[PDB]
């Protein structure tokens with residue numbers, strides 16, 4: 001669920017998730033997808049596409065277990081959907097962290113009209 | 122959907138909805154409800170409870186029609202659920218405007234996992 005995703009994002013990036021990613025670019029936080037403005041935004045795009053792939057669980061609502069071991073997010077599920085869901089969240093948290101180097105505040109609260117259509121997943 | 126909700130908030134409050142209300146207190150934003158931090162937050166609390174009563178439509182993604190007449194949000198007939206949804210959104214937008222005076226930027230990006238459990242609606 002969003003609770004685990006937000007925690008992973010904090011864990012990986014060290015940043016308040018809503019502040020840095022609640023509305024960033026065309027894919028982070030915003031509703032729907034759009035052509036990514038940069039790497040951080042692409043992480044969110046990949047994430048939404050990852051969610052689109054799930055079957056059997058609600059990405060927003062379903063809780064799942066995971067742990068922090070050797071400073072790594074370790075999913076703790078066997079159910080295919082919760083496992084994949086957890087893995088989707090883990091990937092976006094890592095990706096956001098990995099792209100902090102090009103994170104650009106000008107994309108915070110990016111206006112949707114400036115977003116081009118996303119390639120489909 | 123979030124588009125309409127955001128537009129209403131912008132219309133009533135004059136503020137960028139994502140920035141001011143995308144994540145505020147324990148109730149404005151993702152992650153259900155929590156004991157409200159202040160009046161602004163209380164608006165979002167009532168708003169989430171309002172959504173609970175909806176049957177047949179998705180508050181997040183289902184778009185609907187409304188008009189700005191005499192500077193008032195006027196919900197389109199749409200269908201029962203969408204009309205109720207529109208009324209839920211209109212109410213929260215009005216409520217946020219009425220309480221703009223006590224908006225506290227300290228609650229923007231409030232960490233959801235530092236909210237007491239909300240009472241049931």
Ligand SMILES: Cc1c(C)c2c(c(C)c1O)CC[C@](C)(CCC[C@@H](C)CCC[C@@H](C)CCCC(C)C)O2
Nearest residue numbers: 002003005006007017018021022028029151232234
């Ligand atoms: C519906 C939906 C939303 C809302 C969205 C994204 C996607 C793919 C969605 O389908 C991606 C990014 C973003 C805004 C990012 C924000 C992450 C939130 C889940 C964060 C909530 C954070 C809390 C729990 C962690 C607190 C930890 C304490 C120790 C401080 O969330």
Ligand SMILES: Cc1c(C)c2c(c(C)c1O)CC[C@](C)(CCC[C@@H](C)CCC[C@@H](C)CCCC(C)C)O2
Nearest residue numbers: 123124126127128131138139142143144149150151
């Ligand atoms: C997953 C999820 C999210 C992310 C969420 C909420 C709920 C119940 C959810 O289950 C409620 C409130 C908010 C806090 C939404 C507040 C703002 C948005 C609706 C922004 C809309 C965009 C605005 C600029 C549009 C302006 C109109 C243009 C014509 C200029 O975010």
